Amino acid sequence: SRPPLEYVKGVPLIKYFAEALGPLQSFQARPDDLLISTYPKSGTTWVSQILDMIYQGGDLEKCHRAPIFMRVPFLEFKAPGIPSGMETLKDTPAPRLLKTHLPLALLPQTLLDQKVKVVYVARNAKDVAVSYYHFYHMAKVHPEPGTWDSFLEKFMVGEVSYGSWYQHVQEWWELSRTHPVLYLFYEDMKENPKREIQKILEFVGHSLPEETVDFMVQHTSFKEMKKNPMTNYTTVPQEFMDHSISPFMRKGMAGDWKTTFTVAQNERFDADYAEKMAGCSLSFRSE
Ligand SMILES: Nc1ncnc2c1ncn2[C@@H]1O[C@H](COP(=O)(O)O)[C@@H](OP(=O)(O)O)[C@H]1O
């Protein structure tokens, strides 16, 4: 009934995900695993659908075997009336696609020791906050988000599920200096998908014919992923997710934040961004 978050080692989490960390202690990573890591609302499902297509040889028929949350186990995931990411993992064939949003501080050390390849996607903070706000509304395990203005404040101080966005994109950016990480930008996936898909291939190590590349580019577009029940979380139960309130597959654009951000909010957020982001070579596009 909109349980409030629970804090674990500085990080605020969904009551249940906090509990899901118990059995996560048991998790043994294989070396052929690949970790998809992102701050919520930055392209998890998109890069997931890309990566599984790669893993099925460009075969849309196989990418339909189950919905995306069953093909790519959500490591820390746990909710009522759905199986825990870890329960789902016990039936996932290798080589396995795995999904988290946990900060390094909560990440299972087995993934780091096993040098598991990581595909990380970042997205400009403004679009993330907007996206995250509507998601909080329709994804009923989160706390009451309140007014946009109040939610935006919380977001600036990382008083939201998975903590601070600013900490998250920065720490994983530094991690890639010691660990195998392809660091991708949502807005780059918008500008030229084909380009970002060939980078994933290089990284994962697969060659595929253009026929099959161009193919994937089309079957991973917002529009196709929106109508595909295996990728749009519409098969989930209503009490866990409610698409009338807001669809998971909401808009899929860069620069949309502008229709929610007040000009006073923008001015303030900008000044706060510069202050937090200033010792960091990362750099985002918002349009
Ligand atoms: N194929 C695609 N291309 C572009 N954006 C996509 C996409 N599939 C999903 N999205 C968008 O990516 C966000 C989902 O993030 P995550 O998977 O990390 O939860 C949502 O953003 P919006 O709410 O801004 O539309 C969703 O609509």
Numbering used by the authors: 8 to 294
From the paper:
The cytosolic sulfotransferase (SULTs) family catalyzes the transfer of a sulfate group from the universal 3′-phosphoadenosine 5′-phosphosulfate (PAPS) donor to a wide variety of acceptor molecules bearing a hydroxyl or an amine group. Of these, the SULT1 family is the largest and is responsible for the sulfonation of phenol, thyroid and steroid hormones, as well as a variety of xenobiotics and known drugs.
To obtain detailed understanding of the molecular basis for the broad substrate specificity of SULT1A1, we solved four crystal structures of wild type (WT) SULT1A1 in complex with different acceptors.
